Predict the structure of Dihydroorotate dehydrogenase (quinone), mitochondrial.
Amino acid sequence: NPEFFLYDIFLKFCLKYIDGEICHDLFLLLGKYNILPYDTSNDSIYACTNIKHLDFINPFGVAAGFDKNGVCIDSILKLGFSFIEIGTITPRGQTGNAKPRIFRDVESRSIINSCGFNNMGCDKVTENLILFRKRQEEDKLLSKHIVGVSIGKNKDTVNIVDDLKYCINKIGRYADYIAINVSSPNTPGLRDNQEAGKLKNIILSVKEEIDNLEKNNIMNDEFLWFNTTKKKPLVFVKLAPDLNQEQKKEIADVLLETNIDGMIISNTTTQINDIKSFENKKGGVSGAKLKDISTKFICEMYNYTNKQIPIIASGGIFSGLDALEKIEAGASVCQLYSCLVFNGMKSAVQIKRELNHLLYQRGYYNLKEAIGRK
Ligand SMILES: Cc1cc2nc3c(=O)[nH]c(=O)nc-3n(C[C@H](O)[C@H](O)[C@H](O)COP(=O)(O)O)c2cc1C
Ligand SMILES: Cc1c(C(=O)Nc2cc(Cl)cc(Cl)c2)cccc1[N+](=O)[O-]
Ligand SMILES: CCCCCCCCCCCC[N+](C)(C)[O-]
Ligand SMILES: O=C(O)c1cc(=O)[nH]c(=O)[nH]1
């Protein structure tokens, strides 16, 4: 397709000269105005997947942090993704840390960021999502597409749970699933909430508010859940890769105890010191250098949780091979971020194609058959 090619050229051009986050905001603006290309192709019936009763038309979505404020949901989805995770959002609008706060290393295909939860706040983003949902109702290309919402706490918030509860009550109705973000490295002391006790209490408080949305309501589910599933949002937790074996064991038990619907593995890491261009910069690292670390984390949690908790994969997914690696490791679905940064508009159509051809070679009937094979 020409359209993708022209954009890929324009993208590569902008990044040689212009600041990374400025380029991101520009392309979000292009998407907001619906000037981006569409992937109108039928997705392979053999590459569809699910997480419990949540159905994905294809196995690739966009990770949190990309469209933090959900100002670009239609256009990003129509690039060929089955879903997008907007946010992370916080109850109140927030600027984030000092710019510049995002840096790429092209040869390493890695990124580092210290954004610090910049977002327009829950109320504004909720209104954005509501507007998307009304558009989705009238757009052939948006049907069956999933939108999750990543939720977190404001910089100066002491009680994380109060912030999580607030977000759920505001935007929960419009979400297909909720992602509890306790793995950002750019909010001090946030990762401490991965402690078994705090985490368990966090998950239960979250599940409790979601359940309470349904009870206080008088309407049919048809009018209560203004989302894709027409059901209450599933609950996922996103984990950081920077833990020890024991911490991972402890968390796995809490996930089972609380009956969490899924786990996103994983967030950015801080253990990467091998990139010279990043030696003076603060933040969490993404991209190719994070792939092996993320994959191992998947195998471990898949094991610790006795294959009972569905897995959403994040970290260094660029190729169909990279994707199948996550899948054979235990993931049901994949999330992209770094891929779009380096491959551009074509990221979804390309990686879907590559994975389709690879499932055929390896003698898989469908995607679901490949989950957790290695
Ligand atoms: C600029 C930037 C912002 C991000 N913001 C969030 C976020 O708000 N919430 C979240 O859970 N993860 C966030 N992430 C982490 C990504 O969602 C993803 O998990 C990580 O980049 C690894 O995926 P990748 O290697 O394919 O890029 C962010 C990453 C980057 C680079
Ligand atoms: C360029 C960049 C991007 C990025 O590539 N964004 C983007 C890429 C595509 Cl292909 C489409 C849209 Cl709407 C946005 C995302 C986050 C950070 C950066 N960056 O700081 O370099
Ligand atoms: C230079 C102006 C004359 C041409 C008018 C603008 C052309 C835009 C049409 C793009 C259609 C793209 N589409 C929908 C096939 O993907
Ligand atoms: O907003 C951020 O700074 C951020 C959040 C997160 O979860 N992960 C990340 O790398 N950055």
Remarks:
- The first strand starts at residue 49 and ends at 51.
